[PDB]
Amino acid sequence: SGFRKMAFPSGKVEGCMVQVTCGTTTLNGLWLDDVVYCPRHVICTSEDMLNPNYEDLLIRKSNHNFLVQAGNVQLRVIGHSMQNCVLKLKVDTANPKTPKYKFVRIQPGQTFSVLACYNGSPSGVYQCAMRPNFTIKGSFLNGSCGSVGFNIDYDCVSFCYMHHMELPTGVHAGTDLEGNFYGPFVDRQTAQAAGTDTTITVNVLAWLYAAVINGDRWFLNRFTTTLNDFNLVAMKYNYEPLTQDHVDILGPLSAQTGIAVLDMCASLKELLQNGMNGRTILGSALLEDEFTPFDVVRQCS
Amino acid sequence: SGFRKMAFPSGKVEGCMVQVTCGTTTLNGLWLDDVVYCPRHVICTSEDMLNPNYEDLLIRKSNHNFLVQAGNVQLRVIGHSMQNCVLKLKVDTANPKTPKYKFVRIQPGQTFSVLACYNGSPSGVYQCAMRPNFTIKGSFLNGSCGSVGFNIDYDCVSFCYMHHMELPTGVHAGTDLEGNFYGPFVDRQTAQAAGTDTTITVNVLAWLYAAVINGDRWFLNRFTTTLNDFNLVAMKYNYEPLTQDHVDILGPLSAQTGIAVLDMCASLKELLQNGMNGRTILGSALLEDEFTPFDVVRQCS
Ligand SMILES: *[C@H](O)[C@H](C[C@@H]1CCNC1=O)NC(=O)[C@H](CC(C)C)NC(=O)OCc1ccccc1
Ligand SMILES: *[C@H](O)[C@H](C[C@@H]1CCNC1=O)NC(=O)[C@H](CC(C)C)NC(=O)OCc1ccccc1
C-alpha cells in the first residue's frame, strides 16, 4: 500500500547521457546509436542568445568546435546537422548502452520521468506532467539543458522531452526529441509568456481513486451528478471539462473501488466548493492533478 | 530554478537487484560481489509468518531451496547464513555490476532513495525520509520486500534500508543492510504499533529556505525570536525542539538568503499559529519536513 510520486528507473537513460561542449557553453546530450542529440543553442554565445540566427551560427561552426565527452572518453564528432531545435552530432562510436527506444511526443496531461543532468552526469530523477499550457514544473539550474524526459512501457524507452529554457514564472519549456517545441516558445532569450493554465480534471479524479484504494474515504458521498452538470462547476474553478472517454479511461479505477465515475465528481465538486476543511488526502492539502489514470493503476496494482 | 522531491539516479542499484525464491515465497535481493542479501522471511510460509522461529526454519532449509535469478540467468547458491533479519546467500558468481558501496545506518530525519522492485525487476524510484518513529511513508505492495534504500555521495552507493513489512497505519518498516530493524519492530505478522511521530523541525526550516531561494517570500517577516522561545511553540504543535547544531547546519542556507535562522523560525511560528491562509509554498499547502538541509543545497546550488 501507499501512493508516492514515482519516477521510472533511470539506468537505461543514464547510459546515454553525454557532455556536449561548443565554445564556452556546455550542456548535456543524448547518445543513441551513433548520434548525439543536444539543444542547438549550445552553438550560441551569451551575445547570440537574445536573437540568434541558428542557421547562421551553424554554418560558421564545424566538427572540431564540438567537444563531446562520454564520461572521461572523448567522442569524435564526424558530422553535424540541425533538426528544428535539436543538434544531431554523428559520432564514430555506436553507444553500446543504447536501449530499445522510441521518439514519442506526449499530450498535455501526461507524465514522464526527468533525469536531471549536469556536465553529462546524472544528478537526480523525478516525475513531471506536461501542463495544459505545454510547460513543466521541474528542477533545472544552469547547465541542465540536454536532460531528457522519458517513459518506459516494457524494455523500450519512449523519449518525449529535452530541456531548453526556463520561463519567467519559474516554469520550464523544451522540445520533443525531434526538436519541435512544446508550446508557443522559441529557443531565444526574449519575453515569452506561457498561456493560462488549467487543472487536469481526469488526473484529479484518478488521484482521488488512488486515495480510496489506500484507505482515504472521508471525501466520499452518496449523491451523484451528470457529466454536463459537473462541467458547470469545473468551468468555474478553472478545471478542464470532462469527456466520455475520460470516464471510460477511469473505468477500471471505478470498478476496483465500486464507486461510479460520476459519483467521484460529486465529491470533487464538494471538494471544490466546500474546500477540504484543513484535512488531507494522501498526505496532500491540495487536489493533485499530475497523476494519470495509468500512474494510479501502475502503483495501485 | 525550481524545487522538486528528487531521487538519486538508480542505475548503479538496478544492476544489483535479483529475484530470490524459497518455496512459494518470492521477494527481491541485493547482489553485491558474491553475496545476495534478502529478507529472512523468504524462508517462511504463510503458516510460519505469525510467530516463526527463523532459526528453526533455516536449519531445515538448504541451498537448493533458494532459487536466485539475475534476470534470466539462474544463480547458484553455494552457501547461506543469517545476519539478524537478513539472509546472506553466497553465490558462485561475483556481480560484475557491483559498485563501490557502504553499509550505512541513517538517523531519523535523513532521506534516501527507494528503488521499488518486484520479482527482481525495478519498478520505480522515489525519495523517503526516515520518520522520527523509524517508519517510512513509501509505496510497497506484495512482493516488494528486498527493495533497498540508498544514497549516493560520489561514485559510492551508501545502502541504508531494506524493506520488510507494512504497518497497520499504512506505513512501512525495514532494516539496515546488516539486518538490524529501524525501530521497535519485528519481522513477524503480529500487532505492531509505531510510536507517536513528530515533525522534523530542521527540515521544515530548510524547506522554507528553498522557497525563498525560488522566489516564495510571502511568509517572511522582520521580527525574530530566541531558540528557547521557539522551542516553546514547537512543543505545542508536535514539532521537534531546535538545537544549536541544527542552526549551524542551517548556516549556509541562512547566508545565501541573508535571513538569520531565528528569523525563519519566527515565520514558522506564525505559519503554525496563523496557518497558511489558503496559500501555497513551493506548490504545497502543508509544511514539508522530508527535505534535509543537504537536499536543499543539492538542488538549490
Ligand atoms: C540550458 O541549460 C538552460 C537551462 C535553464 C537555466 C535556468 N533554468 C533553466 O532551465 N537554458 C537557458 O539558459 C536558456 C537558453 C536560451 C537560448 C533558450 N535561457 C533561459 O532559460 O533564459 C531564462 C533564464 C535564464 C537563467 C535563469 C532563469 C531563466
Ligand atoms: C514483503 O514483500 C512484504 C511487503 C508488504 C506487503 C504489503 N506492503 C508491504 O510493504 N512484507 C510482508 O508481507 C510482511 C511479512 C512479515 C513476515 C514481516 N507482512 C506484512 O507486511 O504484514 C502486514 C501486511 C500484509 C499485507 C498487506 C498489508 C499489511
Closest CA to B85 of B139, B21, B24, B38: B38
- How far is Cα A247 from Cα A263, in angstroms, rounded to an integer? 11
Mutation to probe ligand 1, out of A142, A163, A187, A188 (largest number of atoms < 8 A from CB): A142
Chain-chain contact of B286 with A280 (C-beta, under 8 angstroms): yes
Contacts of B187 (CB under 8 A, 6+ apart): B39, B40, B41, B54, B85, B164, B165, B181
Q: Residue A74: how many CB atoms within 10 A of its CB?
A: 11
* Ramachandran assignment for B269, one of left (phi > 0), alpha (psi -120 to 50 degrees), beta (any other): alpha
Strand partners of residue B157? B101, B152
Q: Residue B149: how many CB atoms within 10 A of its CB?
A: 26
- How far is Cα B78 from Cα B91, in angstroms, rounded to an integer? 5
- How far is Cα A26 from Cα A143, in angstroms, rounded to an integer? 7
- How far is Cα B216 from Cα A125, in angstroms, rounded to an integer? 23
Mutation to probe ligand 2, out of B48, B165, B186 (largest number of atoms < 8 A from CB): B165
How distant, in Å, are the alpha carbons of A21, A26, A39, B257 from that of A45? Answer: 12, 11, 13, 30
Measured in degrees and rounded to the nearest 5, phi and psi for residue A229 equal -85, -30
Q: Are A93 and A16 in contact (CB under 8 A)?
A: no
Q: Are B253 and B296 in contact (CB under 8 A)?
A: yes
Closest CA to B75 of B43, B37, B109: B37
Measured in degrees and rounded to the nearest 5, phi and psi for residue A255 equal -80, -40
How distant, in Å, are the alpha carbons of A9, A133, A160, A271, B125 from that of A113? Answer: 9, 19, 9, 29, 10
- How far is Cα B295 from Cα B292, in angstroms, rounded to an integer? 5
Q: Which residue has the cell 509544511?
A: B287
- How far is Cα A298 from Cα B138, in angstroms, rounded to an integer? 15
Closest CA to B168 of B147, B143, B185, B145: B185
Return the HEC string of A31-72.
EECCEEEEEHHHHCCCCHHHCCCHHHHHHCCCHHHEEEEECC
| In A169-292, alpha helices (H) | 201-213, 227-236, 244-249, 251-257, 261-274
> Which ligand 2 atom is at minimum distance from the Cα of B28?
2
In chain B, what is the greatest distance between 2 CA atoms, to the nearest angstrom?
A: 69
- How far is Cα B156 from Cα B241, in angstroms, rounded to an integer? 33
Strand order across the beta sheet in which A35-39 lies: A73-75, A66-70, A17-22, A25-32, A35-39, A86-91, A77-83
Q: Residue A285: how many CB atoms within 10 A of its CB?
A: 17
How distant, in Å, are the alpha carbons of A95, A153, B53, B167 from that of B123? Answer: 25, 11, 32, 22
Cell output for B74? 539462474
Q: State the angle between helix axes of B261-274 and B227-236 in degrees (0 to 180), rounded to the nearest 10.
A: 30
Q: Are A49 and A188 in contact (CB under 8 A)?
A: yes
Q: Which residue has the cell 535469478?
A: B69
Cα A143–Cα A147–Cα A148 angle in degrees, nearest 5:
165
Q: Is A263 helix (H, G, I), strand (E, B) or coil?
A: helix
Q: Which residue has the cell 533458494?
A: B66
Strand partners of residue B277? none
Of A145, A160, A265, A300, the catalytic one is A145
B189, with CB counted inside 10 A (0-12, 13-18, 19+), is middle
How distant, in Å, are the alpha carbons of A10, A119, A229, B17, B119 from that of B71? Answer: 17, 32, 51, 9, 9
Q: Which helix (H) or strand (E) holds A13?
A: helix A11-14
Structural class in CATH, domain B201-300 = mainly alpha
Contacts of B144 (CB under 8 A, 6+ apart): B27, B28, B116, B117, B118, B163
Chain-chain contact of B170 with A2 (C-beta, under 8 angstroms): yes
Q: Whose CA is nearest to atom 19 of ligand 1?
A: A165
Closest CA to B18 of B101, B60, B76: B76
Contacts of A93 (CB under 8 A, 6+ apart): A34, A70, A75, A76
A138 C-alpha to ligand 1 centroid (Å): 13
Closest CA to A199 of A277, A287, A281, A284: A287
A166 C-alpha to ligand 1 centroid (Å): 5
Parallel, antiparallel or unpaired: strands B157-166 and B148-152:
antiparallel
DSSP chain B: ------BPP-HHHHTTEEEEEETTEEEEEEEETTEEEEEGGGG--TTGGGS--HHHHHHT--GGGEEEEETTEEEPEEEEEEETTEEEEEESS--TTPPPEEE--PPTT-EEEEEEEETTEEEEEEEEE--TTS-B-----TT-TT-EEEEESSS-EEEEEEEEEE-TTS-EEEE-TTS-BSSS--SSSS---PPPP-B-HHHHHHHHHHHHHTT--TT--S----HHHHHHHHHHTTBPPP-HHHHHHTHHHHHHHT--HHHHHHHHHHHHHH--TT--BTTBSS------HHHHHHH--
B51 C-alpha to ligand 2 centroid (Å): 14
Closest CA to A10 of B291, B16, B122: B122
- How far is Cα A229 from Cα A256, in angstroms, rounded to an integer? 25
B48 lines ligand 2 (CB under 6 A): no
- How far is Cα A295 from Cα A203, in angstroms, rounded to an integer? 9
- How far is Cα B84 from Cα B77, in angstroms, rounded to an integer? 20
In chain A, what is the greatest distance between 2 CA atoms, to the nearest angstrom?
A: 69
- How far is Cα B242 from Cα B237, in angstroms, rounded to an integer? 13
Cell output for A58? 551553424
- How far is Cα B8 from Cα A241, in angstroms, rounded to an integer? 37
Annotated catalytic residue A85:
no
Measured in degrees and rounded to the nearest 5, phi and psi for residue B283 equal 75, 10
Closest CA to B278 of A283, A277, A294, A83: A277
Q: Residue A213: how many CB atoms within 10 A of its CB?
A: 18
Closest CA to A47 of A151, A189, A170, A209: A189
Parallel, antiparallel or unpaired: strands A111-118 and A101-103:
unpaired
Ligand nearest to the CA of B43: 2
